[PDB]
Amino acid sequence: ADATDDYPIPNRIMRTPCTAEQIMAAARDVEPVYYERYMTDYKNKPPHVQQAARDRIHWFFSMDYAGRRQYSENTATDAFFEQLAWMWPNWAKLFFNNKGVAANTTDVCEQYPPDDMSVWNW
């Protein structure tokens, strides 16, 4: 079985100080196909969950490394620890990507503008 660094939530994504808008902006440019899929599912959930997901990712950016530590520990302890997973487990599928997406978004979220609010409404 071994072990991989793809679990828990991508270390590259978690240990990078970028806003959701920043990573989302990078994500829509790097992988628009997957971004649209996420957006389609994002619009599928009600505003309450959409805002809830946003609130949770907002805390991630605000806590930053602290958020990374808590998210890593919380998911390590229990994947269903997140109360958002209770309502929708794909609340952060865009961020939960261990493909080249994690490397590309981390390496460019540091350059895209954090005030890109067009990521919330494409």
The percent range for helix content is 55-70%
Sheet-strand content, in percent, reads under 5%
Query: SS-based structural class?
Result: mainly alpha
Spatial gap, N to C terminus: 40 Å
* Coarse shape: globular
Main β-sheet description: none
Number of domains: 1
Say how many strands there are. Answer: 0
Radius of gyration from the alpha-carbon trace, in angstroms: 14 Å
Compressed to H and E, one letter per element, the order equals HHHHHHH
PDB class: unknown function
Keywords: DUF5078, unknown function
Assembly: monomeric
Entry title: Structure of MS3494 from Mycobacterium Smegmatis determined by Solution NMR
